[PDB]
Amino acid sequence: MKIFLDTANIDEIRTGVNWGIVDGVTTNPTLISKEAVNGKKYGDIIREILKIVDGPVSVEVVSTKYEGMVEEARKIHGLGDNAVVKIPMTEDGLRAIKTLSSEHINTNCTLVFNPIQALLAAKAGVTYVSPFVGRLDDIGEDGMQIIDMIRTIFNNYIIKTQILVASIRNPIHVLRSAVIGADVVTVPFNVLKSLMKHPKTDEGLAKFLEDWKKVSPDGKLIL
Amino acid sequence: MKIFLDTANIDEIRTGVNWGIVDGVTTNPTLISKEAVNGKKYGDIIREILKIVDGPVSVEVVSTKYEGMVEEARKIHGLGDNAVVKIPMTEDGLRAIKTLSSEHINTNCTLVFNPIQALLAAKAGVTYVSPFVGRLDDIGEDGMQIIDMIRTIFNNYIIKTQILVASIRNPIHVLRSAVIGADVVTVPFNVLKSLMKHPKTDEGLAKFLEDWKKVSPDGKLIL
Amino acid sequence: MKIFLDTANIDEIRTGVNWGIVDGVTTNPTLISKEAVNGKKYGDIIREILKIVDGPVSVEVVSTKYEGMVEEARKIHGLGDNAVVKIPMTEDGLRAIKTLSSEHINTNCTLVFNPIQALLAAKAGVTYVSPFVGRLDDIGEDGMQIIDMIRTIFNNYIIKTQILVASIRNPIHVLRSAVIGADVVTVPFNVLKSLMKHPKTDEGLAKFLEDWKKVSPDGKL
Amino acid sequence: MKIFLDTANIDEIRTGVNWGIVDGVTTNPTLISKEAVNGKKYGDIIREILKIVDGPVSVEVVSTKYEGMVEEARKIHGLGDNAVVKIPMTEDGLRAIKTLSSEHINTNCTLVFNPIQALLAAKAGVTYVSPFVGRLDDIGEDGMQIIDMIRTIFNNYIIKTQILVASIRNPIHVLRSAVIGADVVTVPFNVLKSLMKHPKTDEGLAKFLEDWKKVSPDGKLIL
Amino acid sequence: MKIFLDTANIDEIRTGVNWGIVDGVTTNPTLISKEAVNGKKYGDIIREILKIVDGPVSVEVVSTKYEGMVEEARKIHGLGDNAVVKIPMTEDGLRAIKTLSSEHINTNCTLVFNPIQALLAAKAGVTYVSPFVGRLDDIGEDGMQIIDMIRTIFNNYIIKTQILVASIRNPIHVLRSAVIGADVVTVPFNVLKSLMKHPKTDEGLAKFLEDWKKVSPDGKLIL
Amino acid sequence: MKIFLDTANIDEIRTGVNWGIVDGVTTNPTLISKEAVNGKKYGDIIREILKIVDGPVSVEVVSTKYEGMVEEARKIHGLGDNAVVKIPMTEDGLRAIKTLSSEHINTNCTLVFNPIQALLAAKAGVTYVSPFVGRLDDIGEDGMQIIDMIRTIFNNYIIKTQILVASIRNPIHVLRSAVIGADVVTVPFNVLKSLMKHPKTDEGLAKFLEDWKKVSPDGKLIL
Amino acid sequence: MKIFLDTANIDEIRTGVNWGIVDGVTTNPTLISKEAVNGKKYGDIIREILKIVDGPVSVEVVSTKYEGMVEEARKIHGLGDNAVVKIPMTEDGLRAIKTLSSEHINTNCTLVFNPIQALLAAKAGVTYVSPFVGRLDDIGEDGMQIIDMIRTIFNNYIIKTQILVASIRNPIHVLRSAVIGADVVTVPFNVLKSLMKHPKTDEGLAKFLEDWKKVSPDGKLIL
Amino acid sequence: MKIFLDTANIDEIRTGVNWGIVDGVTTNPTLISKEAVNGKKYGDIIREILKIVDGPVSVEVVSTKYEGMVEEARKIHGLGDNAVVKIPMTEDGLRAIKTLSSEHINTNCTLVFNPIQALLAAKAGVTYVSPFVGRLDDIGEDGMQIIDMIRTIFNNYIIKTQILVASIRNPIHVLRSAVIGADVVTVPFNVLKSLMKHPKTDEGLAKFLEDWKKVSPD
Amino acid sequence: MKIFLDTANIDEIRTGVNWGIVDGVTTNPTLISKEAVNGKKYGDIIREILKIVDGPVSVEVVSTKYEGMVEEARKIHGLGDNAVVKIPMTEDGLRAIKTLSSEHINTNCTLVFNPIQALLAAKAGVTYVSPFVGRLDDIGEDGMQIIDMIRTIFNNYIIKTQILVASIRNPIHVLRSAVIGADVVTVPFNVLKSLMKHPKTDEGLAKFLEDWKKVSPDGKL
């Protein structure tokens, strides 16, 4: 399972990449808006992310119309080989995906909330689909069940579109995604950090340290 | 999973194909007649669809007897290599399917209501079998269960006949067909249009747009 | 399981009632306004339905504010003892349901789309809760799963609020509702009229008549 | 799933084959003793049923002893390469099957009533095993469960012996056989006919005819 | 299922109570610390909550020692009949619960992370146990499974202690609690608010309003 | 679920009882001998436990023959109305249990390793049956499965003999016993002590303490 | 679950009863024909087996016809109120059971091999039904599944007929009977003896003896 | 599924070999001692079985020590290429199996009663492992469950060791072994014969005979 | 499934190796320091174990910092080709594993308590991951469930990291591991020595000897 970071915050990205556990980044217009404040420009933010991340970086078009989507998508693609064009699940969006796929431009269909939307995006030839599990949770429906269904549907038809679980809120979204076999999860930084941690890991390390001090007061391993 | 339209309206066909999620077309004399207005010739409508659609277009034979069915099926086949001849599940229809299959004329066995009917049609060499799920629902039997059994039977024997789910009435017939692994669904243009929609898609897109305006007043993405 | 008819069409209601299988009626502002055209007034349509139907008849408030909702509810109640006040699942709606329940006015909480909304409506004291299964189907989610969860939740807490399955589109919503154990279904007329029918019933009746004529040429017993 | 006809009555093969859903024929001493009356000889019977069939015809030995069974089997064989010799599940029967299998004579082990008897016949090299599901039903045991176990056992060991469901009494034996994945079912000509029928099919055809008459009051599709 | 509000924020409490959907309140030392700032005293906050909430209000002891726990618990109890003394799952805590239960003082055992801790608290006679599902989620374990086990254990022994699901983070914690049959959930205000909402409710109300305007331009129901 | 200690140490007993989660005591000659030091009389230790414990204390008979077992059991019973006589699953032990049960002397059938042994002991009238789960685990068989079957058998026949899970080695034996619905577990004092612990309990309590100090410098709760 | 002894051999009742685990006895013509040799008469046999048993003794009629069966049953009865008359599952058998049940003579219907035969015997008023699980095992059918179905059927209808599992061959027939909830099992005296044994029991006793010798080198518990 | 005959009785083997439904034979010291009476030598009993039986013949070493085991084994092997050396599940036995496997001498590890024992035998390179299901039944545990677990474990690790179900007591042990997918069952003679029988087969043969008499009075 | 011995006790290791059923050894700082007493040096204990054991031998770094971890890892590797470097599940640990994997030094990620930690370790390229089942049991959670999830996750992504079940306390952890399909178990000596044994094996051997003596009074073949 690939793990992407879901943020436009450059510090978070630099940090996660250096932990070596981040395989790509997703952004969206909200995430970018949060960073493009106090004189910081969205164009600079987008270019910098592409620059410092080796894996896929998703950048969303803002046009709602077919022609605007493809125009902006080709611009995004032109920014770097690792750029992936996010396109929303709409009529114009599917048309754009079909065109962009025929142009060999990688795409990510976003704002997906049920399995049939995911299938339609896959049929249009999208590279990734991004269902928003947390926003389904928000409305009283267990979002992970939609990931399970998408995985089954894709398996049925040997679909190569990657399932990219998005709107992740907690480490159980991550665990269930892995158990289901989703291709990718994209997670906020605070979630990313939490995935490494466990109280028994902390406790176990402290105990090993204490016991070792008995055999080596300076705490070193001299071999 | 392939998606066919129950329609004879080229505008709908063109639009669905442009979305990249329509793989062929299913017709009947009524669907075609519907369009034969304001100078439109019944025959031109069918030949126009055949020419424009890269994939399959099902057209029903009206004869009820073997000889009439094969003569009619041959005339249908003569109109396009992608025409598929729709033949009902009857004793004479099975005989017709067997003959036509040997002539390498593609076929679609319709009015299928249980899995053994579907198996017999596959044994005669039929290209597609079309169970009518909504008509089972109509009589208080869950039509999708018949699709599930047909998928299992066909899988057991590596049967190459495609399951074409028909009499579809709602997007859950579509969802369940995908999860089961049916080869094809055929749907009205409006059922088709509904398949892309979700209120969280609309709300999410609206919030993205609003947030983007905060950093790009004219709503543009200049890259 | 009770079976209600989901319509404001008087002709459909008379026909269904005459069949003997309609236990009540549900209306909503869309259904009523569909009928209230070409001269017909909504107040007349609502009164007529109340008169015709012996069983519960759901009529929805239009106010979005608590105060307006309770005022309209009391007027609806005043129209006849079989009237049931439909109140939407909103903050003001829950307040209104609680007040109306205390005044012993039967209520029906509508526009319910998940099991927790249904539980909130029950906690407010609502008489019926009406989840919309077909509208969930419309957006790619199996609406009947919500009914199954609501039945389990209500069973767990011995909740007396009745589960009223609404936005029904086909006879399988009805079958599944019965297997789950929902208290009520409300069905459009076209669905209602299909529930008694089966092709093997028709065929069996024909066969029985055929065979009986061999006994009595005239066809009587 | 292959479908054989299970009768000795010539009136009840050509037409089944013409439907494209008949793969062969079976019989038995009883079924033979039914048509070998009023001047018709069993010799004539069995003959009339080999030349025309592009498939398998099961013919049952009457000898209860090894030498007799094998002698009979050779005679039966001699009548054609597609002849299949039916041998009961007995000590001598297993011996005969092993010998005949080594002589490349095709065999069908009948009177099988549990899964271990089926395995034994397979181990002796039998071409088909025929469990009698209806006779298990007669004694208050669901016969189809035996077919399910045999399927599982044969799958476990990649056994090439074909499961031939016999003593079929209704269309649900047929349905369940297909869902389980039995290789073959043998059914009387009439059960066979019932398999294609459904009242919604009849209804559907009448609807199609009615509506075609609207499009074209004549009753024929001119193309 | 009872729904408590998990907060010490007086405005949130007043608001939730007036929605009529809140049956009680839980606090803890962190929650209170958040409010007891800028001159506001914890004693005043606690008394005000007890004052304005009719249902149970949980207030946690801060002593870690048996004698301190019971001293503080009796003080809390003395503040009002609706007060429930929160006691942590520790050795001294269980001793305190046993004593306080014999004194007819309602108790709530908190910081519970597995089912056997819950059982021990129930054996000591506690009125509620409060497992922290979100903090289990935090460490990569699905916290709702612990609620399921506790429900089964309590059902087994007809235990009257109430299961109070705490550390709730989202509406799916709430939904799963209800399906399991937990006695109580305690939720933060933002979660509380979300439970009432659904996009199709909003959409449905807007449509009813629009349609009604056709029949009554002023939008009123005059009866 | 009742909890017994495998111990003869009054300090442990007193402590566990004070926690409110110990319902009785199980002993053996070794456990008792352990404590018989520094002037301590073997006999006084057993009589002290009997007097102090309100509930049950199991003491094993050492005779292997019927007459010896009943004479010894009577002497054990004479020491306290709460003494329970532990008798092994043997032919003579069953005879002894039947006799003793008629004298209304409570009994505990030990060295039970399968569910039918447990059923026979219940049929003889035994008060408790003690399956040794850890000793089954020792030989590569999951001991808790035997507890599960005994619970089902006892439930089937409304058997009033209590299932006393013994040879417990870890807290999961305890958890599984509770989920199954065993009547009693017997555990060493240290297994018992471990049952209350969880690292999230410790961390949570520490954070609560820290947060409280922010508003009450001396860490007190003055109410 | 009641436990009967299934033999006609007097050497193989007093001791079973003394263990407190025997509720009664059954026999049959074969088992009788085994002990009625070398000068012993069946009359003597059956007698020696009624007076001493505080329970049920099954005695089988030999007549195959109604009048004879009922005549025999009265004689059998006359020997004691606890006598139970064994009647085979036949047309005349069902008649006899109905008559005897109306005369308040207790009956046991034997030679039952499927669940519907069991139901029929219950409907005629039989006191016990005895399915032969081992003889089903002999013919490649898991006999215990029949007991499971009978249990379910009897539960559905609150049937008071007791299920008496017969033709028991091993301890797992006994275990499964108990788990299913059969009312009774009848077993030979030896199978009976095997039921109490387990090698870990033997091992455990030896351990206890060894360690007792440490506490008290003498070998006796002085209390 | 292969089927072996589990006996040391020459008459039974002969009768069963004559059926041609036997794929091999297992013996053990108990069963050998049964027939090694009335002047009969165990050595004669074994060479005889080996000669008559084409398939694998399991013959058990009697030594309990490693060195006595491999020497015994090597001499059992010398008696015929179809000989399979039966070695018990013990420390020395595992070591002997390791040595014998490497010498390309086929082995059968016996007295196995749980799945981890069976795994240890497979790790030693054993050709067959023989769990004793009936002896588990005897002590109140369903023996077939152990076979089910061994099949799963062996599947997990693509283990080539064959599962040889032993201590078989009835035809349901056999049926369940087949459904699980055990490689081999070994059965006592009375069990083997019963496996072909069923009352509806008998009733069926009779009816066919009766009806055939109508068609040809012969 | 490989079976490793979890101890730094030389006598236990020699004994287990001589039995032929030990495929490797795992150590940790607690196990080593237990042995490194009354004059014994840890460097000598570690070297001795490496010499005795043919299979993989896990030896844990003590540094908590990346740089220290890699330095110590290289020294451990230098002690013998069978050495496997144990690295804890921490941020610095994952970095160290990635670097060491690139240098073709076998690694074992330890102190793993949930399936996502295990996945992170695999993504870093670790040779083995070692979840601690008994320590999960200690805190009231069935540790084996974590192994089952890790096996499923690893299967889904065709992950080549070996699952090494650690903190094993009884033979059922071992049985369950095998049924799940874990690649390795590491077991304390007391558990190791129980795996070959069963009371029915002992009884069957006794019976076989008894019966054989009736054939040969001297007891040979």
HEC letters along chain I: CEEEEECCCHHHHHHHHHHCCCCEEECCHHHHHHHCCCCCCHHHHHHHHHHHCCCCEEEECCCCCHHHHHHHHHHHHHCCCCEEEEEECCHHHHHHHHHHHHCCCCEEEEEECCHHHHHHHHHCCCCEEEEEHHHHHHCCCCCHHHHHHHHHHHHHCCCCCEEEEECCCCHHHHHHHHHHCCCEEEECHHHHCCCCCCHHHHHHHHHHHHHHHCCCCCCCC
Q: Which of I27, I60, I62 to mutate to test the interface with A (most CBs of A within 10 A)?
A: I62
- Choose the closest CB to F208 out of E29, E76, E120: E29
F26 touches chain H (CB under 8 A): no
- Cross-chain Cβ contact I203/G199 below 8 Å: yes
Judge contact between I4 and I185, C-beta under 8 A.
Answer: yes
Residues 6 or more apart whose Cβ sits within 8 Å of residue E219: C62, E209, E212, E213
Compute the distance between CA of residue F85 and CA of residue F125 in angstroms, rounded to an integer: 13
Question: How many residues can be counted in chain E?
Answer: 223
Beta-sheet pairing, I57-60 with H83-88 = unpaired
Report the gap between the CA of B189 and the closest CA in chain A (Å).
Answer: 13
Compute the distance between CA of residue C123 and CA of residue I183 in angstroms, rounded to an integer: 52
I194 touches chain G (CB under 8 A): no
All chains having 3 or more CB pairs closer than 8 angstroms to chain E: A, B, C, F, I
Q: In one letter, which amino acid is E52?
A: I
Question: Residues A213, A216, A217, A221: is their CA dihedral positive or negative?
Answer: negative
Chain H neighbors of I170, CB-CB under 8 A: none
Report the gap between the CA of G101 and the closest CA in chain D (Å).
Answer: 26
Residues 6 or more apart whose Cβ sits within 8 Å of residue A172: E137, E140, E142, E143
F145 touches chain H (CB under 8 A): no
- Cross-chain Cβ contact A140/E175 below 8 Å: yes
H211 touches chain D (CB under 8 A): yes
Q: Do chains C and D have 3 or more beta-carbon pairs under 8 angstroms? A: yes
| Phi/psi at I130 (5° precision) | -120, 90
Task: Domain I1-221: give its CATH superfamily.
Answer: Aldolase class I (3.20.20.70)
Query: How is residue F145 written in tokens?
Result: 């499965």
Chain G CA closest to residue D115: G140
Candidates D56, D53, D48; CA nearest to D11 is D48
- Choose the closest CB to B116 out of D18, D174, D200: D174
Query: How is residue G181 written in tokens?
Result: 């909830």
Q: Which of A114, A141, A145, A147 to mutate to test the interface with C (most CBs of C within 10 A)?
A: A141
Chain B neighbors of E199, CB-CB under 8 A: 199-200, 203
All chains having 3 or more CB pairs closer than 8 angstroms to chain G: D, F, H, I
Report the gap between the CA of H208 and the closest CA in chain D (Å).
Answer: 5
A140 touches chain E (CB under 8 A): yes
Q: Which of F116, F133, F153, F157 to mutate to test the interface with G (most CBs of G within 10 A)?
A: F116
- Choose the closest CB to I175 out of F134, F140, F169: F140
Residues 6 or more apart whose Cβ sits within 8 Å of residue G37: none
End-to-end CA distance of chain I: 35
- Cross-chain Cβ contact A179/I153 below 8 Å: yes
- Cross-chain Cβ contact F200/A199 below 8 Å: yes
Annotated active-site residue E86? The verdict is yes
All chains having 3 or more CB pairs closer than 8 angstroms to chain H: D, F, G, I
Chain F CA closest to residue E28: F208
Compute the distance between CA of residue G95 and CA of residue G99 in angstroms, rounded to an integer: 6
Q: Please, which residues 169-188 of chain F have a Cβ atom closer than 8 Å to chain E?
A: 171, 174-175, 178-181
Question: How many residues can be counted in chain H?
Answer: 218
Q: Which of D19, D184, D222 to mutate to test the interface with B (most CBs of B within 10 A)?
A: D19
Compute the distance between CA of residue A9 and CA of residue A193 in angstroms, rounded to an integer: 15
Put residue B146 in one of left, alpha, beta given phi > 0 → left and psi -120 to 50 → alpha. Answer: alpha
Nearest 10 degrees: Cα torsion F153, F157, F159, F164: 10
Long-range contact set of residues H207-214: C-beta below 8 Å, sequence gap at least 24: H207/D30, H208/D28, H208/D29, H208/D30, H208/D60, H208/D62, H208/D88, H209/D29, H209/D62, H209/D64, H211/D29, H211/D30, H211/D32, H211/D33, H212/D29, H212/D32, H212/D33, H212/D62, H214/D33, H214/D36, H214/D37
Report the gap between the CA of E70 and the closest CA in chain C (Å).
Answer: 34
Chain E CA closest to residue F182: E156
- Cross-chain Cβ contact B101/D221 below 8 Å: no
Chain H neighbors of D30, CB-CB under 8 A: 207-208, 211
| Phi/psi at D112 (5° precision) | -100, 130
Chain F neighbors of H117, CB-CB under 8 A: 140
Question: Which listed residue (D86, D98, D193, D197) is catalytic?
Answer: D86
Put residue E85 in one of left, alpha, beta given phi > 0 → left and psi -120 to 50 → alpha. Answer: beta
- Cross-chain Cβ contact A20/I89 below 8 Å: no
Q: Which residues of F are catalytic?
A: 86
What's the fold here for domain H1-218? TIM Barrel (3.20.20)
Neighbours of D12 (CB within 10 A): 16
Compute the distance between CA of residue A118 and CA of residue A159 in angstroms, rounded to an integer: 11
Candidates D134, C13, A144, H101; CA nearest to E172 is A144
Query: How is residue I135 written in tokens?
Result: 């320590």
Question: Which listed residue (E86, E160, E213, E214) is catalytic?
Answer: E86
Candidates E123, B185, D53; CA nearest to A123 is B185
F212 touches chain E (CB under 8 A): yes
Domain boundaries, chain C: 1-221
- Strand, helix or coil for residue C31: helix
Chain C neighbors of D199, CB-CB under 8 A: 199-200, 203
Q: In one letter, which amino acid is H205?
A: L
Query: How is residue H7 written in tokens?
Result: 């006996």
Report the gap between the CA of F107 and the closest CA in chain G (Å).
Answer: 14
| DSSP run (H or E) holding E66 | helix E66-78
Residues 6 or more apart whose Cβ sits within 8 Å of residue A100: A70, A73, A74, A85, A87, A107
Query: How is residue D70 written in tokens?
Result: 């094998």
Compute the distance between CA of residue D69 and CA of residue I188 in angstroms, rounded to an integer: 64
- Cross-chain Cβ contact F117/G201 below 8 Å: yes
Judge contact between C139 and C108, C-beta under 8 A.
Answer: no
Chain F neighbors of I143, CB-CB under 8 A: 172
Q: What one-character-per-residue DSSP string does D94-106 give?
A: HHHHHHHHHTT--
B20 touches chain E (CB under 8 A): no
Q: In one letter, which amino acid is H144?
A: M
- Cross-chain Cβ contact A172/E197 below 8 Å: no
Chain F neighbors of H115, CB-CB under 8 A: 140
Q: What is the DSSP letter of D47?
A: H
Q: Which of G138, G172, G179 to mutate to test the interface with H (most CBs of H within 10 A)?
A: G172
Q: How far is CA D67 from CA A52, D93, D117, H193, I115, in A?
A: 85, 10, 22, 21, 66
Report the gap between the CA of D185 and the closest CA in chain C (Å).
Answer: 27
Q: Does domain A1-223 have CATH number 1.10.4190.10?
A: no
Q: How was this structure determined?
A: X-ray
Question: Which listed residue (G86, G193, G197, G200) is catalytic?
Answer: G86
HEC letters along chain A: CEEEEECCCHHHHHHHHHCCCCCEEECCHHHHHHHCCCCCCHHHHHHHHHHHCCCCEEEECCCCCHHHHHHHHHHHHHCCCCEEEEEECCHHHHHHHHHHHHCCCCEEEEEECCHHHHHHHHHHCCCEEEEEHHHHHHCCCCHHHHHHHHHHHHHHCCCCCEEEEECCCCHHHHHHHHHHCCCEEEECHHHHHHHCCCHHHHHHHHHHHHHHHHHCCCCCCCC
- Cross-chain Cβ contact I138/F194 below 8 Å: yes
